[PDB]
Amino acid sequence: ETSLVRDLLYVFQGIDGKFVKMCNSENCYKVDGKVAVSKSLKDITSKLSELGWLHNK
Amino acid sequence: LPSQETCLVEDLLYILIGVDGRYISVQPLVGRQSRSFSVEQNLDSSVKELVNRILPVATNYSTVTRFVEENSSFEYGQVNHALGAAMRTLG
């Protein structure tokens, strides 16, 4: 929860935060590598990617 | 984590004063006049990289406080000696 709030701050300032995201093009998509978690983090972190890909351009 | 960020921020503020810190070490390039500052590895690599955008500021601050140190060391009477005093005032 709060670690994902901190993780978006670092891509908002620049390039990847807690984990590696390996995409500087077409959006900076976040990969957590977890499947047992809810499927509702992948769409929020998809919105955090268009703010981070627009930032580094 | 954020306390480890905060002491790195305080180390960064000493580096911009123009003085050597604790965890941020100074590496000489041409005689440590163009200072390539190097911080250690952090458990969060991103906040370390945000500091990496800020070490060129003290690098360039070290170039101009030593530019105005150099022109007065040979007691130049020229107009560059008066240009550097504005740089001392801006410093």
Asked if residue B46 lies in contact with residue A15, where contact means CB atoms within 8 angstroms, the answer is yes
Number of other residues whose CB lies within 10 A of the CB of residue A10 = 19
User: What is the separation, in whole angstroms, between the first and last Cα of chain B?
Assistant: 34
Pick from A6, A14, A18: CB nearest B49: A14
Query: Does the CB of B52 have a partner CB in chain A at under 8 Å?
Result: no
> What token pair was written down for A38?
């809810």
Count of helices and strands (H, E) across chain B: 5, 2
Q: How many CB pairs under 8 A join A and B?
A: 20
Resolution (A): 4.8
Residues of B in contact with A18 (CB under 8 A): 44, 46
Q: What is the CA radius of gyration of chain A?
A: 11
Least Cα separation, residue B45 to chain A (angstroms): 7
Query: B44: which residues sit within 8 A by CB, 6+ positions away?
Result: A10, A17, A18, B1, B4, B5
Return the H-helix or E-strand segment holding B16: helix B2-17
